[PDB]
Every structure is written in structure tokens, then in C-alpha cells.
């Protein structure tokens, strides 16, 4: 079945977040092929357990601990996939479904071993970066970003102050303006994501674009 | 936790059977670090589900379906171990505990792939044969044995009829006499096991030693 229920919901919410979708209960229900009311029952208990808040707008907001797990689940999932693909040679059409069971039972140590053995752990076979490899072994953007991805709102871009200007069009093409509710992250390497499009910001631009919490 | 409860109990019972131990509820309880009464509750439901009978003598007797699963669980477990060891390079001290989670979520297809990729699937890293590789892709012994291992009783040995005699001592050393409750199997290659010692019987001896059900 789902193997680990809470972890299913956690990885679901991450993945909605990566696609730029608002992690709504109905969205999660749909993705998991579960019922809405079954979904609220689980969300209730994830709340209790400290993994989630149900925000004003009804969006599931992962607590930092919640987001840490979700990231860990996701990293296991993606590495099981690389493992299944690169090494085992499992039919690509079953790799995901399999990794959907293995994500819940892979130890940290096995993950660490997989980093050693595989050729490249930058992305899953399905083209998505693998997160949390570090964990394993108004307000300026440069200052509002952390290690973990938050949706925030663009409050000003300040193109007047910029020497380097080729990213003006990259933002525009990403419909990043005004704004304009985008996910920001970190590493300095800040990324603005908008639905679900990435603009890797050069430092001058990150230092000058300002955000506000939603 | 146990990941899959029924499958835990099934593989436990197999493994008691392989060591020549009588699969008693208290034995299973002890192995799983569960309580006796928790063990009867599970056994009740495995009965319902058709996987087990509780025999006169209070021994758990796997139904053929039960024994088929148990074999499949065991084969997954052992191949996860080979996989963990040979390929992943997981610390040998954690290989078992890990395979204890992976045994419940490995597909048949993944198993089949593992047969291709690994060098030798004859035994687990812990020295136990891997069973069911075929499934995946009074009464004479030759006639009482099937593909799946039954404990039966030795009713006569008939050493008077034997040309080849070097196995006389092999039986004796295995305390196989009179007898004498032993597991028998198949392939012709019949094996008599006694606690938990194997005598691979040559054909003349298998054709002439007679058994009775317990
Ligand atoms: Ni996947
Ligand atoms: Ni899953
Ligand atoms: Ni083991
Ligand atoms: Ni297990």
C-alpha cells in the first residue's frame, strides 16, 4: 500500500512545492488517490505530530521538522530510483513505483553508500534534483533565502541599480515581476522559482531584489 | 517497525524450520521480541487469512500458500542481503537489519534483475541457501518428498539392501535413525535434515528409506 502514510503526504507536499503548485489538501488527495476526508484525517494527525500547519489560505505549511523529513524521504526516493536504474537495471516503467516502496525503508547509511557507488547523484532518472545531500554527509532576497525553499512575494526588482542586465529577460520570461509569488532558496546561489521555472540569480540581482512574506 | 507483520511471522517460521526447531508460538514470540498473547492474536488472523494452522501439538503448520509466501519473503530477504553486501557495500553489521525492511517491498521483477546482476545467488552472505529461485524464473522417501520441506518420521532405513554404504555413517553422525523426525525435500536430489544438519541422499538410499507423517 502507501508503506508509510505520513511520509507519502510529506513527499507529495514537497513535490507539489517543486512543481510550483499550492499544496492544497484537495491536490494531495488527488495525487495520492485518496479521499478528501481521509486526507483531513491524516493532516489532523500530522498537525498533532508537528509536521504541518494548515494556514489561513488552507495551504499545508510544513514545519521545519516536517520539511526536513520530506526532504529526507525525497532524497531516499530519488537515490532508490538512480539505484534501480543505473545499477539494478529495473524496467524504467517500474522504477518509480518500486522507489515509492523503497523510499520508506532505506537507512541513511545505505544512502551514503549509494553516493559512493553511483556515477552521479545530482538528479533522479526523472530529471529532478536530489535534495538534502548536505544533511546526509522590503527585505533583500540575499537575506530572506535559507537552505530550505519558501514561497514569498516580489516587492521590488530595482532594475535601475543593475550593471548586469541579461537576467532582466530571464525574469520576465519566468513571469517574475511586481510581483509575484515565487519560491526562493540558497547556497551565494539563490534561485527564484515560478511555476515551476528556475532563474539562478547572480549576486548583484539577489542583493537588490526585495521580498515580503505572503 | 516490522514493516509487514504477517510476512515477519512467515519468514520467522521458515527460519525456525531451517534451524530444525519446532515453530512454536513461544519461539516466534521470542524471536520477534513480541509477547505471547500478541503472537496468538496475529496467528488467529494468519489462520483466517489461510496462511497457518495451529496443529495438535501446538506447532504452526504453514498452509501450502503460507509456505509459498514465506519462501518468497525469504528469497527477497536473502537477495537484498547479497545486494546490500556485494554491490552497495553496506557495513556487514547492518546488512541484515536493512534486508529486514527491504524483504517486504522488493518486487519479483527487482528479484529477477538481481539474479542477473549479482555473481552468485546460491547463498545469502550469512550462509543460508536462497530458496524459491525456480518459482521466480511405510512410504518411500523418494515418493514422500516434494519441492517444499516437510518434517516427517523415519520408519525404516533398510541398510541390508544397500550396495553403497558410506552414507550409513553420515546418517548416524546426523543422529538420523529408528527414527527420528527429520525434514525431507526434493529436486532426484533429496535431503534429510536433522537439527539443522543436511544429508544429501544418493538415489538408492532415498528409494529405500521409508517415512511416516508425524
Ligand atoms: Ni519518483
Ligand atoms: Ni512511497
Ligand atoms: Ni537476514
Ligand atoms: Ni522484515
UniProtKB/Swiss-Prot annotation, chains A, B:
One of its GO terms (cellular component) is cytoplasm. This is Diphtheria toxin repressor. Gene3D superfamilies: 2.30.30.90, Iron dependent repressor, metal binding and dimerisation domain, Winged helix-like DNA-binding domain superfamily/Winged helix DNA-binding domain. GO terms for molecular function: DNA binding; DNA-binding transcription factor activity; protein dimerization activity; transition metal ion binding. The keyword Transcription applies. Keywords: Cytoplasm, DNA-binding, Iron, Repressor, Transcription, Transcription regulation. Pfam families: DtxR, Fe_dep_repr_C, Fe_dep_repress. Belongs to the DtxR/MntR family. Residues 2-63 form the HTH dtxR-type domain. Iron-binding repressor of the dipheteria toxin gene expression. May serve as a global regulator of gene expression. Represses ripA under iron excess. The keyword Transcription applies. One of its GO terms (biological process) is negative regulation of DNA-templated transcription. It is found in: Cytoplasm. Homodimer.
